[PDB]
Amino acid sequence: GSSGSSGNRANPDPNCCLGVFGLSLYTTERDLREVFSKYGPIADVSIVYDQQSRRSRGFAFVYFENVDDAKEAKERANGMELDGRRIRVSGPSSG
Q1: CB within 10 Å: which end of the chain, N or C, has fewer?
Q2: Where do the RRM domain residues begin and end?
C-alpha cells in the first residue's frame, strides 16, 4: 500500500502576477485601481500606452500584495464589464 498523495508546490509560482488584456479605450491606472480596489488592497498598477494614439494600448499590469490577494480578482476580473467595455484577465508562468 503506502499509496497516498495530494500535491504541493515549493517555489513561489508567478500566479500572483496578474495581467489584464483588451481594456477600454480611455483607461487610466486610476479607473482600474479603483475598480479593483473594491476587491482589496493593491500594490501597484501600470497600464501600457501607445506612441501614436493618445489612448490605452489594450494591455495593463496589476500587481497585488500577495498571491491569494490577487486570486480574488483573477477570478472576478476575467470577462468583466468595465465602462461598457469588457476586459479579460490572464496569468502565465513563463514571461
Answers
A1: N
A2: 16-89
